[PDB]
């Protein structure tokens, strides 16, 4: 029924920090969010 | 400590057991329900059960809801055909506030027109939610078919009365049925003197027996729903003994002999005689159990079956034949003893939890006045003889029967055929 | 079929705004000054545009 | 007014005060930078290289 | 005139003793004549790989179906004859078999539990019958929307991790499972150090320990060929799984963020926060006047039939969030209000609602631990997870330490600017796209 | 209507030059305008409510 | 004394002239709207007809005949209890919100 | 099995109770 | 309560226009030229207004 479908692997798209499946995501969440928000901040400064 | 029972001069019964537990549960049990509704005011009990949070003379709806939530308490209304129970549960420190709220709700309701009109839709919402399980509608129709009077009234408001319940009807029902002689204030974790003080404070007014409902009269009818559900729920019952009678205990033992509820998850109900008796005949998904309902005036006993629409007749016939075999005397002493053990264990497990103990004390207080210790109840169970079980089976077989069926009903037998 | 005044989007907006707008029956002449302001604005816009052709 | 003169509203006020102060700081910096207000920038190091 | 603190002090204390093989025997004694004795095993779907997933459910299904000492009917006959109720529950992290029975029947109950745990027949014919039953039950469980949406939440949140697997398992595994796989599962996961024998009610700890030494002693914690299963931390992946089925009447959405483990101290403030958020169903009488702002708005606008907040905790990760059933055209509004409440707790929580949440949590803790069955369940689960049954007094102290500052801190850590995991079922077209959902997790004002 | 007359008075003063008679009239008109809008009208409304047994 | 000036204001205000009563002329804020929806149906229908007749009279710039004007004593404050209850409930909700 | 058709509630929990009504192993079968 | 973006009338129009407008997921960069035209129109208006201050 609803137990015959598994979320398809996105590893090819995933960032290296979260590629591992035995590592807590919260450890690298701050890093990844910092990177994205840094990109945003630099864009805003330029604008 | 031990349970303390006091019958006040106004007729109210106050009970308290200091369990020395973190939580204290106070319940007011009132001898009102669907039974005491007449034809004109059908469903008033339902809205009264829903209207536990409406504005009272002492407190507004906002104050009641917010305060009970702030102390983390719960206010629950439990209604049977013969009883309505208002209970408040919270930590022992804040029990006084919830006790004040409970007595304000029970003794001084306002039933303001706008609030009742707003709540009238909750009647239909609750009825729909309850009727999702077919068992509710089947049992409602079973009670309607069995009795022509008080007990036939549904626990849920009839559809034509959804918007027609009036505040005056609610006030009349409360005034004539919420009375001191009809009430019992049961407390767990609360000292007896405090409960007594609160009872004098609020429950002094509206004394007396109040309006009395007529005795329930057996009708012996059938109601067939034809709702098109795959499985067919069918209940075949006959009149039995009133609660708190020797034959009532005999009927309970008979119910456990035939089979009441599986004890092993995903089991075969090996001890249950009806289950095996049907199972050998029918290899399709099926279910069967013994329906034992006891009320103060009278009771119903019989078989409830859930089976595939095509095979409903076989299942009902097999269960009925197994009951007939019990009636003819094919009952072993070992089966009686095992059923007695199951019933005694069920009583103990029911009174194990705080909610179960409060409900049992309230039911005993309302039905019989005094509280009977669990040991005496077990002794009553033991006193039942095998001959009594056989005679109960003979009474069920011989007596006129009422049936309610829901589902496809293409092959479901009528009462005459059975 | 449907009424074009109700159905068509621009006509729907115009209809609700001015044609079938629910209005109180008792509003007096003082309420006409809003429409008078609208007419004054339109007249000023046209008049000033035609002045600006020569200014 | 008397409605908002309550201890819970005081608690909410304390909760949002640092945020309000930060937004005020943002506004001050924004104004000084956009206008290139020399009075303030004069002290600012390495921004004083201009003007 | 006992006070709440005095009542907590007077609670009977759980005594924990360990058999040499590693079985931990725990008991809480009460004057009640009825007792609930159960074996809690630290085995579940999270300890199962892909091919053997669902073997735990199969073993649970056929555990009561017979033993080598007593055949299939015999166990049921004994249990029913003594009046006992035998029940089992399997979760992703725990598996348990408990017997509700009279106190005088404790020895026989312990015998039956030991027979079920150790000497399970796993007979092949019964295996085929249970295979058919389990396939039918999977088809039935498809109907239960709440279970499906929670399974989707686990699948999308813990993708690529054993936690994603359902307890029942894929149907293909169910039909492919064999007696060897079930026996291997029992041999690998049912071990004495990973089992707890817990009882509540009229049970003497000395008597329970002696019965355990009599019956469970043979069970061993040695792993054949030193093949020892090793616990694996599970990664939490922010993801969205939408099963759009417009035929369904109402839409179920479950949204969660990664939460603390069982032993993490932050669970208590988070439970207080969730109690502040509250729970609502259409059948609730409180309606608009209910303290929970989300519940009040939902009742006023009839946004959702039901909404509840859940704090599911596993050993190293957990799902923290809420599940709400609503109309097709009210999903976006309810999501907005839920995220607004989350951010309000994160940023500007107040003392009064914190007191309300603490009181609600205290009442839930005390009310749940009522009766032999819940008390025994709490004992077993606490021994397996916390390694100790946290006494109610300790829970009260930890709750009392919670303040508005603590709630704001923990909610900001777990809920603010954190990628959520969303599972939707039914007419979920109005459910906001994941970018909008993630944007809602932070406030531009703060 | 006092406020309307005050606005008429202010118009007249603005037309006229800033000399002795008009300066005091203008100051009084301005004070009266602000007083009528800010203090007199709300207080009079409260008095009216009291009169109507509100 | 005070009743004299109050009666003067009652005649000075024209809502008696239009056949209205005092509670008909109250400004319909949220509390007033809740009070109106709480009115019994007879009071509600009387209210709507009074206001409709008054609006009609104002439309044609006419006034009701002198004998049909409302009397200062006969004026009944139908909406006052309901509005007071609404205001009291709102005050309680605000007070609970305060702390 | 009375199967008292309980309703989920907080601060107002309407519960109505009926008599033993089976529905014991329907999921199992 | 209601979200101001969905309930306030001006905000309602703005939301339905360029916030919650259901847009196809596959529109290409050829579908940005309309917004580019709108930006060009606003830019031309501003620039021409500043030019006309000296023309
Ligand atoms: C170019 C300027 C204006 C235009 C085109 C305009 C237009 C309108 C129109 C057409 C109406 C419909 C009702 C009526 O016409 O009486 C109206 C109503 C209204 N306007 Fe304006 N108006 C303008 C200036 C103002 C100003 C300066 C104010 C306040 C200082 C104002 C406030 C109002 C108000 C309060 C109403 C409500 C009328 C009612 O209650 O029926 N308007 N306006
Ligand atoms: C809509 C409200 C408008 C108002 C209240 C307004 C008001 C005035 C006033 C008071 C003058 C001076 C008249 C004089 O003393 O000779 C004037 C002149 C002028 N207005 Fe407007 N105007 C409006 C709209 C427009 C528009 C839309 C245009 C567009 C081109 C425009 C173009 C002019 C021009 C070119 C003059 C100078 C020619 C002249 O003074 O005769 N006006 N306007
Ligand atoms: C779609 C909008 C517009 C277009 C396509 C447009 C087009 C043009 C073009 C092709 C020129 C010739 C410039 C040159 O020869 O160097 C011009 C000049 C000019 N336009 Fe526009 N125009 C637009 C809007 C406006 C507006 C809104 C204004 C005033 C409010 C304006 C005022 C002027 C002025 C003052 C000039 C003179 C600039 C010069 O001499 O170089 N234009 N416009």
Automatic annotation (TrEMBL), chain A:
Protein name per Swiss-Prot or TrEMBL: Ubiquinol-cytochrome c reductase, Rieske iron-sulfur polypeptide 1
Superkingdom of origin organism: Eukaryota
Shown residues within the full chain: 104 to 150 of 299
Location within or outside the cell: Membrane
Transmembrane segments: none
Protein family according to the UniProt entry: Belongs to the Rieske iron-sulfur protein family.
TrEMBL record, chain B:
Keywords tagged on the record: Acetylation, Electron transport, Membrane, Mitochondrion, Mitochondrion inner membrane, Respiratory chain, Transit peptide, Transport
Gene Ontology molecular function terms on file: metal ion binding; metalloendopeptidase activity
InterPro entries: Metalloenz_LuxS/M16, MPP/UQCRC_Complex, Pept_M16_N, Pept_M16_Zn_BS, Peptidase_M16_C
GO cellular component, one term: mitochondrial inner membrane
Gene Ontology BP terms: proteolysis
Domain Peptidase M16 N-terminal: residue ranges: 14-159
Bilayer disposition of the protein: Peripheral membrane protein
Location within or outside the cell: Mitochondrion inner membrane
A Pfam family the protein falls into: Peptidase_M16
Peptidase M16 C-terminal domain ranges (all copies): 164-343
Top-level division of the source organism's lineage: Eukaryota
Predominant location: mitochondrion
Record-linked PANTHER family: CYTOCHROME B-C1 COMPLEX SUBUNIT 2, MITOCHONDRIAL, METALLOPROTEASE
Assembly behavior: Component of the ubiquinol-cytochrome c oxidoreductase (cytochrome b-c1 complex, complex III, CIII), a multisubunit enzyme composed of 11 subunits. The complex is composed of 3 respiratory subunits cytochrome b, cytochrome c1 and Rieske protein UQCRFS1, 2 core protein subunits UQCRC1/QCR1 and UQCRC2/QCR2, and 6 low-molecular weight protein subunits UQCRH/QCR6, UQCRB/QCR7, UQCRQ/QCR8, UQCR10/QCR9, UQCR11/QCR10 and subunit 9, the cleavage product of Rieske protein UQCRFS1.
Family statement drawn from the similarity comment of this UniProt entry: Belongs to the peptidase M16 family. UQCRC2/QCR2 subfamily.
Name the record gives this protein: Cytochrome b-c1 complex subunit 2, mitochondrial
Gene assigned in the entry: UQCRC2
UniProtKB/TrEMBL annotation, chains C, I:
Positions with a binding annotation for ubiquinone-10: 35
Positions that bind heme b 1: 31, 34-35
UniProt: heme b 2 binding residues: 31
Compartmental location: Mitochondrion inner membrane
Transmembrane intervals: 30-52
Annotated heme b 3 binding sites: 44
Known partners and oligomeric status: The cytochrome bc1 complex contains 11 subunits: 3 respiratory subunits (MT-CYB, CYC1 and UQCRFS1), 2 core proteins (UQCRC1 and UQCRC2) and 6 low-molecular weight proteins (UQCRH/QCR6, UQCRB/QCR7, UQCRQ/QCR8, UQCR10/QCR9, UQCR11/QCR10 and a cleavage product of UQCRFS1). This cytochrome bc1 complex then forms a dimer.
Function, in words: Component of the ubiquinol-cytochrome c reductase complex (complex III or cytochrome b-c1 complex) that is part of the mitochondrial respiratory chain. The b-c1 complex mediates electron transfer from ubiquinol to cytochrome c. Contributes to the generation of a proton gradient across the mitochondrial membrane that is then used for ATP synthesis.
Family (UniProt): Belongs to the cytochrome b family.
Protein name: Cytochrome b
TrEMBL record, chain D:
SUPFAM superfamilies, A to Z: Subunit XI (6.4 kDa protein) of cytochrome bc1 complex (Ubiquinol-cytochrome c reductase)
GO biological process: mitochondrial electron transport, ubiquinol to cytochrome c
Primary location: mitochondrion
InterPro entries attached to this UniProt entry: Single_a-helix_sf, UQCR
Compartment list: Mitochondrion inner membrane
Lipid bilayer topology: Single-pass membrane protein
Pfam families cross-referenced by the UniProt entry: UCR_6-4kD
GO cellular component: mitochondrial inner membrane; respiratory chain complex III
Transmembrane segments: 20-40
Keyword Coiled coil carried by entry: no
Keyword vocabulary terms for this entry: Electron transport, Membrane, Mitochondrion, Mitochondrion inner membrane, Respiratory chain, Transmembrane, Transmembrane helix, Transport
Family that this chain belongs to: Belongs to the UQCR11/QCR10 family.
UniProt-listed PANTHER family: CYTOCHROME B-C1 COMPLEX SUBUNIT 10 (PTHR15420:SF2), UBIQUINOL-CYTOCHROME C REDUCTASE COMPLEX 6.4 KD PROTEIN (PTHR15420)
Subunit-level organization: Component of the ubiquinol-cytochrome c oxidoreductase (cytochrome b-c1 complex, complex III, CIII), a multisubunit enzyme composed of 11 subunits. The complex is composed of 3 respiratory subunits cytochrome b, cytochrome c1 and Rieske protein UQCRFS1, 2 core protein subunits UQCRC1/QCR1 and UQCRC2/QCR2, and 6 low-molecular weight protein subunits UQCRH/QCR6, UQCRB/QCR7, UQCRQ/QCR8, UQCR10/QCR9, UQCR11/QCR10 and subunit 9, the cleavage product of Rieske protein UQCRFS1.
Name of the protein this chain belongs to: Cytochrome b-c1 complex subunit 10
Organism: Sus scrofa (Pig)
């Amino acid at each position: 029924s609803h137990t015959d479908i598994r979320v398809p692997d996105f590893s090819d798209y995933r960032r290296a920090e979260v590629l591992d499946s035995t590592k807590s995501s919260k450890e690298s969440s701050d890093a990844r969010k910092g990177f994205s928000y840094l990109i945003t901040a630099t864009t805003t400064v330029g604008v | 400590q031990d349970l303390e029972f006091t019958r006040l001069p106004n007729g109210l019964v106050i009970a308290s057991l200091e369990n020395y537990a973190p939580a204290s549960r106070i319940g007011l049990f009132i001898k009102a329900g669907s039974r005491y509704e007449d034809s004109n005011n059908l469903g008033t009990s339902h809205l009264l059960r829903l209207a536990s949070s409406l504005t009272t003379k002492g407190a507004s709806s906002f104050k009641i809801t917010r305060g009970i939530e702030a102390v983390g308490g719960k206010l629950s209304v439990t209604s049977t055909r013969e009883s309505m129970a208002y209970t408040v549960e919270c930590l022992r420190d804040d029990i006084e506030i919830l006790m004040e709220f409970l007595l304000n709700v029970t003794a001084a309701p306002e039933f303001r027109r706008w609030e009742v009109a707003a709540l009238q839709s909750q009647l239909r919402i609750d009825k729909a939610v309850a009727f999702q399980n077919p068992q509710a509608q089947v049992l409602e129709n079973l009670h309607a078919a069995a009795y022509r009077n008080a007990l036939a009234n549904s626990l849920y408001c009839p559809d034509y009365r959804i918007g027609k319940v009036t505040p005056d009807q609610l006030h009349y029902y409360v005034q004539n049925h919420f009375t001191s002689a009809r009430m019992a204030l049961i407390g767990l974790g609360v000292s007896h003197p405090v409960l007594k003080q609160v009872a004098e404070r609020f429950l002094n007014m509206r004394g007396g027996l109040g309006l009395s409902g007529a005795k329930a009269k057996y009708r012996g009818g059938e109601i067939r729903d034809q709702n098109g559900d795959s499985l067919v729920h069918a209940a075949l019952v006959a009149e039995s003994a009133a609660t708190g009678s020797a034959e009532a205990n005999a009927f309970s033992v008979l119910q456990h002999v035939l089979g009441a509820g599986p004890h092993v998850k995903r089991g075969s109900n090996a001890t249950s005689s009806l289950y095996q008796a049907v199972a050998k005949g029918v290899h399709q998904p099926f279910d069967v159990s013994a329906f034992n309902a006891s009320y103060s005036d009278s009771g119903l006993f019989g078989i409830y079956t859930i089976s595939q629409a095509a095979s409903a007749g076989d299942v009902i016939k097999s269960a009925y034949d197994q009951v007939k075999t019990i009636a003819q005397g094919n009952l072993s002493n070992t089966d009686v003893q095992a059923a007695k053990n199951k019933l005694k264990a069920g009583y103990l497990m029911s009174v194990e939890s705080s909610e179960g103990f409060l409900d049992e004390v309230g039911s005993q207080a309302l039905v019989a006045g005094s509280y009977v210790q669990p040991s005496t109840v077990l002794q009553q169970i033991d006193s039942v003889a095998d001959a009594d079980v056989i005679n109960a089976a003979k009474k069920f077989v011989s007596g006129r029967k009422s049936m309610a069926a829901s589902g496809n009903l293409g092959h479901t037998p009528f009462v005459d055929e059975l | 079929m449907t009424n074009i005044r109700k159905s068509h989007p621009l006509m729907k907006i115009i209809n609700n705004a001015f044609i079938d707008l629910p209005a109180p029956s008792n509003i007096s002449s003082w309420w006409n000054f809003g429409s008078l302001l609208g007419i004054c604005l339109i007249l000023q816009i046209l008049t000033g545009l035609f002045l600006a052709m020569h200014y | 007014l008397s409605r908002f003169l309550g201890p819970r509203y005081r608690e909410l006020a304390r909760n949002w005060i640092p945020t309000a102060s930060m937004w005020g700081a943002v506004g001050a910096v924004g104004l000084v930078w956009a206008t290139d207000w020399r009075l303030i920038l004069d002290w600012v190091p390495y921004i004083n290289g201009k003007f | 005139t006992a006070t709440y603190a005095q009542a907590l002090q007077s609670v009977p204390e759980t005594q924990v003793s360990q058999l040499d093989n590693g079985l931990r025997v725990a008991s809480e004694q009460s004057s009640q004549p009825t007792c609930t004795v159960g074996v809690w095993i630290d085995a579940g779907s999270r300890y199962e790989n892909e091919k053997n997933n669902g073997a735990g459910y199969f073993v649970e299904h056929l555990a009561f179906k017979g033993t080598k000492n007593r055949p299939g009917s015999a166990l049921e006959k004994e249990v029913e004859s003594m009046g006992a109720h035998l029940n089992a529950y399997s979760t992703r992290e725990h598996t348990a078999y408990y017997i509700k029975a009279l106190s005088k029947d404790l020895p026989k109950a312990v015998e039956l539990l030991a027979d079920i745990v150790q000497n399970c027949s796993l007979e092949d014919s019964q295996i085929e019958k249970e295979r058919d039953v389990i396939l039918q039950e999977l088809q039935e469980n498809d109907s239960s929307m709440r279970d499906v949406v929670f399974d989707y939440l686990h699948a999308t949140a813990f993708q690529g991790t054993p936690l994603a697997q359902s307890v029942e398992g894929p149907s293909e595994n169910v039909r492919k499972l064999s007696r060897a796989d079930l026996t291997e599962y029992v041999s690998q996961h049912y071990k004495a150090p990973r089992m707890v024998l817990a009882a509540a009610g009229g049970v003497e700890h000395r008597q329970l320990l002696d019965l355990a030494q009599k019956h469970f002693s043979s069970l061993s914690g040695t792993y054949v060929e030193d093949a020892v299963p090793a616990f694996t931390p599970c990664r939490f992946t922010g993801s969205e799984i939408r099963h759009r089925d417009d035929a369904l009447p109402l839409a179920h959405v479950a949204i969660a963020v990664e939460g603390p483990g069982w032993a993490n101290p932050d669970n208590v403030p988070l439970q207080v926060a969730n109690a502040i958020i509250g729970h609502y169903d259409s059948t609730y009488g409180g309606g608009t006047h209910m303290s929970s702002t989300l519940a009040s708005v939902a009742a006023t606008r009839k946004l959702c039939q039901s909404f509840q907040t859940f704090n599911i905790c596993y050993a190293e990760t957990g799902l923290l969030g809420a599940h709400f059933v609503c109309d097709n055209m009210s999903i976006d509004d309810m999501m907005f209000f839920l995220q607004g409440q989350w951010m309000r707790l994160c940023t500007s929580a107040t003392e009064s609602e914190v007191v309300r949440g603490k009181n609600i949590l205290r009442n839930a803790l005390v009310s749940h631990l009522d009766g032999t069955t819940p008390v025994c369940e709490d004992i077993g689960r606490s021994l397996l997870t916390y390694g100790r049954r946290i006494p109610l007094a300790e829970w009260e102290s930890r709750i009392a330490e919670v303040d508005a500052s603590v709630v704001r801190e923990v909610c900001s850590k777990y809920f603010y600017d954190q990628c959520p995991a969303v599972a939707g079922l039914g007419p979920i077209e109005q459910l906001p796209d994941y970018n909008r959902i993630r944007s809602g997790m932070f406030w531009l004002r703060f | 209507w006092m406020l309307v007359a005050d606005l008429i008075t202010l118009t007249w003063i603005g037309g006229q030059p800033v000399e002795h008679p008009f300066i005091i009239i203008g100051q009084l008109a301005s004070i009266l305008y602000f007083l009528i809008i800010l203090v007199l009208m709300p207080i009079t409304s409260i008095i009216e409510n009291n009169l109507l047994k509100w | 004394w005070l009743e004299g000036i109050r009666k003067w204001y009652y005649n000075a205000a024209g809502f008696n002239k239009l056949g209205l009563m005092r509670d008909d002329t109250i400004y319909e804020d949220d509390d007033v709207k809740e009070a109106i929806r709480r009115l019994p149906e007879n009071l509600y229908n009387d209210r709507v007809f009074r206001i409709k007749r008054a609006l009609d009279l104002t439309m044609r710039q006419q006034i009701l005949p002198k004998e049909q004007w409302t009397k200062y004593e006969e004026d009944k404050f139908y909406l006052e209890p309901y509005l007071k209850e609404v205001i009291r409930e709102r005050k309680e909700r605000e007070e609970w919100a305060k702390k | 099995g009375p199967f008292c058709a309980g309703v989920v509630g907080h601060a107002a929990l309407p519960a109505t109770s009926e008599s033993p009504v089976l529905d014991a192993k329907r999921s199992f079968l």
